[PDB]
Design brief:
4 copies of one chain form a homotetramer. Chain A is mainly β and 220 residues long. The first copy, chain A, has one domain: Green fluorescent protein (Green Fluorescent Protein), CATH 2.40.155. Chain A is 2% helix and 56% strand. The first copy, chain A, has an 11-stranded mixed barrel. In chain A, strand 1 (7-17) and strand 2 (20-31) form a beta hairpin. The radius of gyration of chain A is 17 Å and the shape is globular. The relative contact order of chain A is 0.22. Chains in contact: A-B, A-D, B-C, B-D, C-D. Chains A, B, C, D: It comes from Radianthus crispa (Leathery sea anemone). Chains A, B, C, D: Homotetramer. Chains A, B, C, D: This is GFP-like non-fluorescent chromoprotein.
Chain lengths: 220, 220, 220, 220
């Protein structure tokens, strides 16, 4: 199989958040079909980070999604060629993060190349003050548009007992020919992003489980 | 006792969309604990509506939500006093609908009073051209904030085989005292709103089912 | 002689900004053909206002525009029937203000009826903190769309030596028969709104001049 | 001295629009002080372009602006070092084009280096159908912010007898030291871009005139 029960992951991330340059490398693994993965991220430049790594966590993998109900798989179908994505995340307190990502394959290794740009995050807000406590689980809305898979999502950043809301606008683009793909219909993807460990705003351990599904409610 | 397995609904709505004024009155019924409901809505002014009623359907019932996993019911706990809600809906083609709603109870009948102001909808878009085909189901994110329950949601209006996305920013306020209320934590509400019939842009039949729940994904 | 060289104006404004309810009444005068006017406004309810009146000033008169180069005058043509407008303004630090207006005539008095709704203005921002110093002059883009006149404009709110930008999206609708109007083509409207006097966030004095024109640049 | 009555221009642009890679090269001339210029553009790769070159036309020159009323010239002051700009253009039908440009000076020749990224242009819209008729003239709002010059603009693409609005967001950054620059005050730049000729979607002739000025309206 071109994709196997176990895949390795190599990630390269670079960017600026409110002017602070940084660079990290991730190494990970996962099960494409069970939709589970982990990743160890080491900040190679700009450490310790003067902001919450939480904002960068969702930049670190849509190949690893368990597809139910025979929902065609835009991401797995795109291999060996791979795919890209481009996201805008707007935080309700002013912050904005934009990211462009290339996903490539090399034998058993998936290669992620990310570039990030963050601005307008408040100086006294939870991200720059580094007082965030991870994400709530989420459900992405996913639908096709002109051969591109579109994503919309509300994510809730834990700030103590409260929540800071951010909004995702994503476009997944295949490197494979649009005609060679079977686009899915409108559906959802549940994502649970967890940070298992963090050390000195420099080393982070992530874990994520994802399932693609239709609504569980009956139709009339 | 207050709330029963079979309840009545009466709705009074008025407002403007892109300058066109309309009033309508609805009568409905449902099972608030099974979180299902129907409503027949009659347009008594501004008929025939020159815009798609779809943009008004979500303005027409948060008492009718089946709560799973012991999730406290903000809405049901608010009776007899009832509650209000305030929503801003932004459409990605520039349209914006603001709604203000009051929910009270008279006998075995819930009373909804609704004010609506839609504006900036494109003259040639699916709303003002009246070419939409109902809503996809959705999953609202819902979380407390100092006595007020907050709602966030991505909705997809069907336009042919394509989709027009809009975003809900809701604030649910109880007319009951805070101390007399058990606020819920972070959770999701699945919603499936369907329009089962419409006639002469003056009569509509809605049906909706809602379930409050947590993420179905396992947690590591 | 339906519109004369000197006209009276009565304005009635009601609204809520960030949930603060208010009512205003205005009386003014102007020269419609010279495109000059002034208004004395009094906050009859919700005084003192807990935000900058500057955001409301553009809601308080497109009859008063000096038209050059034989540009057809959509607004003056609409009398005696009159016209309506509505506008969505978006502030770049999060604020959104929707407004809808009716303009009617009563002999020598123009009657303005305004409904305003502001939300998402940041508590720390210069609007809610009341730290703004009036608007810079602006040039609106005016174009016809199917018997409706559309307006786009970038306005700059002075905040010390800085500027906070907001974006206007306006639709002017004649209450006169569409076929009875001579629509203009694409053109510009220069507008200079000044706040001459303010007192205790309760009384305000405005002066505005406006000119309709084409670009002064030569065409090649 | 550094700039002359007549200057040469050379441009190197590349990027993608809805995923179509293109490369093109320009050569031009103009009078920096008179504020006029022209350019010939050749699509060296990705010809014939499957979209309206109209979207790329505003990416091809702020050195060529006639400054009135003794307004400081951010762009002419920036030489020999030169300057950069970065723009986002949003079309009201969903299209978005982001560009980053570098302006340098070698002898009597200004060198432009442009990277374009265009996405979400409707498949049946006038851009991708290549059915536009150039731009209307415009007036950019320009204002200083911490040594950076900020530009805001509403532009209108002619499509048949109607207009498709788009919105420019630009930051111009000088490569010259802040202290070696007298920043201008708040002002406008009138701009009229014209396409005098096009051939086989691989050759285009442009002409542009710009004037920097204050509002023509009196100040009461």
């Amino acid at each position: 199989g071109l994709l196997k029960e176990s895949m390795r992951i190599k990630m390269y991330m670079e960017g600026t958040v409110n002017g602070h340059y940084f660079k990290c490398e991730g190494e990970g693994d996962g099960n494409p079909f069970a939709g589970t993965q982990s990743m160890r991220i080491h900040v190679t430049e700009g450490a310790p980070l003067p902001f919450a790594f939480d904002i960068l966590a969702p930049c670190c993998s849509r190949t690893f999604v368990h597809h139910t109900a025979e929902i065609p798989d835009f991401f797995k179908q795109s291999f060996p060629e791979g795919f890209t994505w481009e996201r805008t995340t707007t935080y309700e307190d002013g912050g904005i993060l934009t990211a462009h990502q290339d996903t490539s394959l090399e034998g058993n290794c998936l290669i992620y190349k990310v570039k990030v740009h963050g601005t307008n995050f408040p100086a006294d807000g939870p991200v720059m003050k580094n007082k965030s406590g991870g994400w709530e689980p989420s459900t992405e809305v996913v639908y096709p548009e002109n051969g591109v898979l579109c994503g919309r999502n509300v994510m809730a950043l834990k700030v103590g007992d409260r929540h800071l809301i951010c909004h995702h606008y994503t476009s997944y683009r295949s490197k494979k020919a649009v005609r060679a793909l079977t686009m899915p219909g409108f559906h959802f993807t549940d994502i649970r992003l967890q940070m298992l460990r963090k050390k000195k705003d420099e080393y982070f351990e992530l874990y994520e489980a994802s399932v693609a599904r239709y609504s569980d409610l009956p139709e009339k």
